[PDB]
Amino acid sequence: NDNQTITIDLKQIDAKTLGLDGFSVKN
Amino acid sequence: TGTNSESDLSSIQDEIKSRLDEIDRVSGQTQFNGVNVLAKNGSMKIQVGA
């Protein structure tokens, strides 16, 4: 019938959305 | 168990709540001939005589 669904979630994973933007170990 | 950390407990709780929501979904959605069997207390009467 209608509205008989399961919801799957997708999270954007990248450097910006993980805090790894500008990660440097040198000056 | 005391060995488990808080993030591990969070993951276990996430899986547990997912399975409980699965149970609730199975309860609500299951229907036979337009009858939600596992969604409401009731009684079914089958004519087995003449």
CSV table of N, CA, C and O in Angstrom, one decimal:
chain,number,residue,atom,x,y,z
A,1,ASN,N,0.8,-1.2,0.0
A,1,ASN,CA,0.0,0.0,0.0
A,1,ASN,C,0.9,1.2,0.0
A,1,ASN,O,2.1,1.2,-0.1
A,2,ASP,N,0.3,2.4,0.2
A,2,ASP,CA,1.0,3.7,0.2
A,2,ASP,C,1.6,3.9,1.5
A,2,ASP,O,1.1,3.5,2.6
A,3,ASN,N,2.7,4.6,1.5
A,3,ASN,CA,3.5,5.0,2.7
A,3,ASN,C,3.8,3.7,3.6
A,3,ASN,O,3.4,3.6,4.7
A,4,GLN,N,4.5,2.8,2.9
A,4,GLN,CA,4.9,1.5,3.5
A,4,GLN,C,6.4,1.3,3.4
A,4,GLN,O,6.9,0.3,2.9
A,5,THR,N,7.2,2.3,3.8
A,5,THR,CA,8.6,2.5,3.4
A,5,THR,C,9.5,2.4,4.6
A,5,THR,O,9.1,2.7,5.7
A,6,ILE,N,10.8,2.1,4.3
A,6,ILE,CA,11.9,2.3,5.2
A,6,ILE,C,12.8,3.3,4.7
A,6,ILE,O,13.1,3.4,3.5
A,7,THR,N,13.3,4.2,5.6
A,7,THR,CA,14.1,5.3,5.2
A,7,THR,C,15.6,5.0,5.5
A,7,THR,O,16.0,4.6,6.6
A,8,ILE,N,16.4,5.2,4.4
A,8,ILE,CA,17.9,5.1,4.5
A,8,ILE,C,18.5,6.5,4.5
A,8,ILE,O,18.0,7.4,3.8
A,9,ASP,N,19.5,6.7,5.3
A,9,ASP,CA,20.1,8.0,5.4
A,9,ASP,C,21.5,8.1,4.8
A,9,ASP,O,22.2,7.1,4.8
A,10,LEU,N,21.8,9.2,4.2
A,10,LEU,CA,23.1,9.4,3.5
A,10,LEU,C,23.7,10.7,4.1
A,10,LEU,O,23.1,11.7,4.0
A,11,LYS,N,25.0,10.6,4.6
A,11,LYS,CA,25.7,11.7,5.2
A,11,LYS,C,26.9,12.0,4.2
A,11,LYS,O,27.7,11.2,3.9
A,12,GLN,N,26.9,13.3,3.8
A,12,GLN,CA,28.0,13.8,3.0
A,12,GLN,C,29.3,13.7,3.8
A,12,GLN,O,29.5,14.3,4.8
A,13,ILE,N,30.3,12.8,3.3
A,13,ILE,CA,31.5,12.6,4.0
A,13,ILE,C,32.6,13.1,3.1
A,13,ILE,O,32.8,12.7,1.9
A,14,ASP,N,33.4,14.1,3.6
A,14,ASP,CA,34.5,14.7,2.9
A,14,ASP,C,35.3,15.5,3.9
A,14,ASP,O,35.1,15.5,5.1
A,15,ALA,N,36.4,16.2,3.4
A,15,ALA,CA,37.3,16.9,4.2
A,15,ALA,C,36.6,18.0,5.0
A,15,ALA,O,36.8,18.2,6.2
A,16,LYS,N,35.7,18.7,4.3
A,16,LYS,CA,35.0,19.9,4.9
A,16,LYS,C,34.1,19.4,6.0
A,16,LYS,O,34.1,20.0,7.1
A,17,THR,N,33.3,18.3,5.8
A,17,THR,CA,32.3,17.9,6.7
A,17,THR,C,33.0,17.0,7.8
A,17,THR,O,32.2,16.3,8.5
A,18,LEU,N,34.3,16.9,7.9
A,18,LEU,CA,35.0,16.1,8.9
A,18,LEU,C,36.0,16.9,9.7
A,18,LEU,O,36.6,16.4,10.6
A,19,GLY,N,36.1,18.2,9.4
A,19,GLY,CA,37.1,19.1,10.1
A,19,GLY,C,38.5,18.9,9.5
A,19,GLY,O,39.4,19.6,10.0
A,20,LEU,N,38.7,18.1,8.5
A,20,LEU,CA,40.0,17.9,7.9
A,20,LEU,C,40.2,18.8,6.7
A,20,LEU,O,40.6,18.3,5.6
A,21,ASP,N,40.0,20.1,6.9
A,21,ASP,CA,40.2,21.1,5.9
A,21,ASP,C,41.3,22.0,6.4
A,21,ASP,O,41.0,22.8,7.3
A,22,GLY,N,42.4,22.0,5.8
A,22,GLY,CA,43.6,22.7,6.2
A,22,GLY,C,44.5,21.9,7.1
A,22,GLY,O,45.4,22.6,7.8
A,23,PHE,N,44.3,20.6,7.2
A,23,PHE,CA,45.2,19.8,8.1
A,23,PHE,C,46.6,19.8,7.6
A,23,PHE,O,47.0,19.3,6.6
A,24,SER,N,47.5,20.5,8.4
A,24,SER,CA,48.9,20.6,8.1
A,24,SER,C,49.7,20.2,9.3
A,24,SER,O,49.3,20.4,10.5
A,25,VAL,N,50.9,19.7,9.1
A,25,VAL,CA,51.9,19.3,10.1
A,25,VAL,C,53.2,20.1,9.9
A,25,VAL,O,54.2,19.6,10.4
A,26,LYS,N,53.2,21.2,9.1
A,26,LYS,CA,54.4,21.9,8.8
A,26,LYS,C,54.0,23.4,8.7
A,26,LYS,O,52.8,23.7,8.4
A,27,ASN,N,55.0,24.3,8.9
A,27,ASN,CA,54.7,25.7,8.7
A,27,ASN,C,55.1,26.2,7.3
A,27,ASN,O,55.7,25.5,6.6
B,1,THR,N,28.2,-4.3,30.3
B,1,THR,CA,29.6,-4.6,30.8
B,1,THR,C,30.3,-3.3,31.0
B,1,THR,O,30.1,-2.3,30.3
B,2,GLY,N,31.2,-3.2,32.0
B,2,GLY,CA,32.0,-2.0,32.3
B,2,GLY,C,33.1,-1.7,31.4
B,2,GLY,O,33.6,-0.6,31.4
B,3,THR,N,33.5,-2.7,30.6
B,3,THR,CA,34.6,-2.5,29.6
B,3,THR,C,34.2,-1.6,28.5
B,3,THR,O,35.0,-0.8,28.0
B,4,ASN,N,32.9,-1.6,28.1
B,4,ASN,CA,32.5,-0.8,27.0
B,4,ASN,C,32.5,0.7,27.3
B,4,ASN,O,32.2,1.1,28.4
B,5,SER,N,33.0,1.5,26.3
B,5,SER,CA,33.1,2.9,26.5
B,5,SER,C,31.7,3.5,26.1
B,5,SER,O,30.8,2.8,25.7
B,6,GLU,N,31.6,4.9,26.2
B,6,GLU,CA,30.4,5.6,25.9
B,6,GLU,C,30.0,5.6,24.4
B,6,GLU,O,28.8,5.5,24.0
B,7,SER,N,31.0,5.6,23.5
B,7,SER,CA,30.7,5.6,22.1
B,7,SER,C,30.3,4.2,21.7
B,7,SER,O,29.4,4.1,20.8
B,8,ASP,N,30.9,3.1,22.2
B,8,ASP,CA,30.4,1.8,22.0
B,8,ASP,C,29.0,1.6,22.5
B,8,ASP,O,28.2,1.0,21.8
B,9,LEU,N,28.7,2.1,23.6
B,9,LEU,CA,27.3,2.1,24.1
B,9,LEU,C,26.4,2.8,23.2
B,9,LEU,O,25.2,2.4,23.0
B,10,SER,N,26.8,4.0,22.7
B,10,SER,CA,26.0,4.7,21.7
B,10,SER,C,25.7,3.9,20.5
B,10,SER,O,24.6,3.9,20.0
B,11,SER,N,26.7,3.2,20.0
B,11,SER,CA,26.5,2.4,18.8
B,11,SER,C,25.5,1.2,19.1
B,11,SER,O,24.6,0.9,18.3
B,12,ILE,N,25.7,0.6,20.2
B,12,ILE,CA,24.8,-0.5,20.6
B,12,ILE,C,23.4,0.0,20.8
B,12,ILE,O,22.4,-0.7,20.3
B,13,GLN,N,23.2,1.1,21.4
B,13,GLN,CA,21.9,1.7,21.6
B,13,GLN,C,21.3,2.1,20.2
B,13,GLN,O,20.1,1.9,20.0
B,14,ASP,N,22.1,2.6,19.3
B,14,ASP,CA,21.6,2.9,17.9
B,14,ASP,C,21.1,1.6,17.3
B,14,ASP,O,20.0,1.6,16.7
B,15,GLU,N,21.8,0.5,17.3
B,15,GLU,CA,21.4,-0.7,16.7
B,15,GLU,C,20.1,-1.2,17.4
B,15,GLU,O,19.2,-1.7,16.7
B,16,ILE,N,20.1,-1.1,18.7
B,16,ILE,CA,18.9,-1.6,19.5
B,16,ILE,C,17.7,-0.8,19.1
B,16,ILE,O,16.6,-1.4,18.9
B,17,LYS,N,17.8,0.5,19.1
B,17,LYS,CA,16.6,1.3,18.7
B,17,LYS,C,16.2,1.1,17.3
B,17,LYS,O,15.0,1.1,17.0
B,18,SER,N,17.2,0.8,16.4
B,18,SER,CA,16.8,0.5,15.0
B,18,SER,C,16.0,-0.8,15.0
B,18,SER,O,15.0,-0.9,14.3
B,19,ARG,N,16.4,-1.8,15.8
B,19,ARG,CA,15.7,-3.1,15.7
B,19,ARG,C,14.3,-2.9,16.4
B,19,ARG,O,13.3,-3.6,16.0
B,20,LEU,N,14.2,-2.1,17.5
B,20,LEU,CA,12.9,-1.9,18.1
B,20,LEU,C,11.9,-1.1,17.1
B,20,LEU,O,10.8,-1.4,17.0
B,21,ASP,N,12.5,-0.2,16.4
B,21,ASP,CA,11.7,0.5,15.4
B,21,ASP,C,11.3,-0.5,14.3
B,21,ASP,O,10.2,-0.4,13.7
B,22,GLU,N,12.2,-1.4,13.9
B,22,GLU,CA,11.8,-2.5,13.0
B,22,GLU,C,10.6,-3.3,13.5
B,22,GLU,O,9.7,-3.7,12.8
B,23,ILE,N,10.7,-3.7,14.8
B,23,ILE,CA,9.6,-4.4,15.4
B,23,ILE,C,8.3,-3.6,15.3
B,23,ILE,O,7.2,-4.2,15.0
B,24,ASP,N,8.3,-2.3,15.7
B,24,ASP,CA,7.1,-1.5,15.6
B,24,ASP,C,6.6,-1.4,14.1
B,24,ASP,O,5.4,-1.5,13.9
B,25,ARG,N,7.5,-1.3,13.2
B,25,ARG,CA,7.1,-1.2,11.8
B,25,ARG,C,6.4,-2.5,11.4
B,25,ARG,O,5.4,-2.5,10.7
B,26,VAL,N,7.0,-3.7,11.7
B,26,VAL,CA,6.4,-5.0,11.3
B,26,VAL,C,5.1,-5.1,12.0
B,26,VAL,O,4.1,-5.6,11.3
B,27,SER,N,4.9,-4.6,13.2
B,27,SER,CA,3.6,-4.7,13.9
B,27,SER,C,2.6,-3.9,13.1
B,27,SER,O,1.5,-4.3,12.9
B,28,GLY,N,2.9,-2.6,12.8
B,28,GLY,CA,2.0,-1.7,12.2
B,28,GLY,C,1.6,-2.1,10.8
B,28,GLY,O,0.4,-2.1,10.4
B,29,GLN,N,2.6,-2.4,10.0
B,29,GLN,CA,2.4,-2.6,8.5
B,29,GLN,C,1.7,-3.9,8.2
B,29,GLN,O,1.0,-4.0,7.2
B,30,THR,N,1.9,-5.0,9.0
B,30,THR,CA,1.4,-6.3,8.6
B,30,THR,C,-0.1,-6.3,8.6
B,30,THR,O,-0.8,-5.8,9.5
B,31,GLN,N,-0.7,-6.7,7.5
B,31,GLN,CA,-2.1,-6.7,7.3
B,31,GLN,C,-2.5,-7.8,6.4
B,31,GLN,O,-1.8,-8.2,5.4
B,32,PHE,N,-3.6,-8.5,6.7
B,32,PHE,CA,-4.2,-9.6,5.9
B,32,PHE,C,-5.6,-9.2,5.5
B,32,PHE,O,-6.5,-9.0,6.4
B,33,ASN,N,-5.9,-9.2,4.2
B,33,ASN,CA,-7.2,-9.0,3.7
B,33,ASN,C,-7.8,-7.7,4.3
B,33,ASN,O,-9.0,-7.7,4.7
B,34,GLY,N,-7.0,-6.7,4.3
B,34,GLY,CA,-7.5,-5.4,4.9
B,34,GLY,C,-7.8,-5.5,6.4
B,34,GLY,O,-8.7,-4.9,6.9
B,35,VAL,N,-7.0,-6.3,7.2
B,35,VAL,CA,-7.1,-6.4,8.6
B,35,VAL,C,-5.7,-6.3,9.2
B,35,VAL,O,-4.9,-7.2,8.9
B,36,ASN,N,-5.5,-5.3,10.0
B,36,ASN,CA,-4.2,-5.2,10.8
B,36,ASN,C,-4.2,-6.1,12.0
B,36,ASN,O,-4.8,-5.7,13.0
B,37,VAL,N,-3.7,-7.3,11.8
B,37,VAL,CA,-3.8,-8.3,12.8
B,37,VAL,C,-3.1,-7.9,14.1
B,37,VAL,O,-3.6,-8.0,15.2
B,38,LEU,N,-1.8,-7.6,14.0
B,38,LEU,CA,-1.0,-7.2,15.1
B,38,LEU,C,-0.9,-5.7,15.3
B,38,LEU,O,0.1,-5.1,15.4
B,39,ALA,N,-2.1,-5.1,15.4
B,39,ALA,CA,-2.2,-3.7,15.7
B,39,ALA,C,-3.3,-3.3,16.6
B,39,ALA,O,-3.4,-2.1,17.0
B,40,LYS,N,-4.2,-4.2,17.0
B,40,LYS,CA,-5.3,-3.9,17.9
B,40,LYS,C,-5.9,-5.2,18.5
B,40,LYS,O,-6.0,-6.2,17.9
B,41,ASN,N,-6.2,-5.1,19.8
B,41,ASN,CA,-6.8,-6.2,20.5
B,41,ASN,C,-8.2,-6.5,19.9
B,41,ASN,O,-9.0,-5.6,19.8
B,42,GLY,N,-8.5,-7.7,19.6
B,42,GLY,CA,-9.8,-8.1,19.1
B,42,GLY,C,-10.0,-9.6,19.1
B,42,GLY,O,-9.2,-10.3,19.8
B,43,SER,N,-11.0,-10.0,18.4
B,43,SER,CA,-11.3,-11.4,18.3
B,43,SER,C,-11.9,-11.8,16.9
B,43,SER,O,-12.6,-10.9,16.3
B,44,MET,N,-11.5,-12.9,16.4
B,44,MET,CA,-11.9,-13.4,15.1
B,44,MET,C,-12.8,-14.6,15.3
B,44,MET,O,-12.5,-15.5,16.0
B,45,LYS,N,-14.0,-14.6,14.5
B,45,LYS,CA,-15.0,-15.6,14.6
B,45,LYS,C,-15.1,-16.4,13.3
B,45,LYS,O,-15.3,-15.8,12.3
B,46,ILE,N,-14.9,-17.7,13.3
B,46,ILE,CA,-14.8,-18.5,12.1
B,46,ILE,C,-16.1,-19.4,12.2
B,46,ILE,O,-16.2,-20.3,13.1
B,47,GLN,N,-17.0,-19.3,11.2
B,47,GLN,CA,-18.1,-20.1,11.1
B,47,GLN,C,-17.7,-21.5,10.7
B,47,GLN,O,-17.3,-21.7,9.5
B,48,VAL,N,-17.8,-22.5,11.6
B,48,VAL,CA,-17.4,-23.8,11.3
B,48,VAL,C,-18.5,-24.8,11.4
B,48,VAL,O,-18.3,-26.0,11.8
B,49,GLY,N,-19.7,-24.3,11.2
B,49,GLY,CA,-20.9,-25.1,11.3
B,49,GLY,C,-21.9,-24.8,10.2
B,49,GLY,O,-21.7,-24.0,9.4
B,50,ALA,N,-23.0,-25.5,10.3
B,50,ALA,CA,-24.1,-25.4,9.3
B,50,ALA,C,-25.2,-24.4,9.7
B,50,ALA,O,-25.7,-23.6,8.9
